[PDB]
Amino acid sequence: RTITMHKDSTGHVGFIFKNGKITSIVKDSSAARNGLLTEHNICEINGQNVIGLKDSQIADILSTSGTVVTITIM
Amino acid sequence: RTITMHKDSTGHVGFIFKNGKITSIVKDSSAARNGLLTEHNICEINGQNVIGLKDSQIADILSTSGTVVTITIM
């Protein structure tokens, strides 16, 4: 349930989340091409367990990540 | 060059912008269905001229708008 994505020229892989759960996918994005889908909880980012982290704490992980971002969902 | 959109259940019409210019479209969104496209400058929102407003000032207009949001682009 692990997806590898790559940031675009604006620094985004292409998803929106809330309460730990993916809610929207950006058109023409890495998230779109790699088949990330709404309504699933985020379990890991770059192999780190993020279950139970606050959205701002997940956002910090995402924003500070380098170009490649791997995400595991439940 | 005027598009009428409708906020979804998360309160979004489905676009990202920077420096007054649309940069991304959300999949399955009102912006997508109504044919908003990247790389154009935002001229008006709900009939108000926003040329020259800061991104935060455009964001306030968008966020405080009711359900229907009309946008004109150059």
């Binding site: 985004h12 892989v13 292409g14 998803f15 929106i16 989340f17 809330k18 809610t23 929207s24 950006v26 956002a59 995402l62 924003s63 | 998360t10 979004h12 990202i16 991304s24």
Partner: peptide, 4 residues
């Protein structure tokens, strides 16, 4: 909302 924020995009990532």
């Amino acid at each position: 909302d924020s995009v990532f």
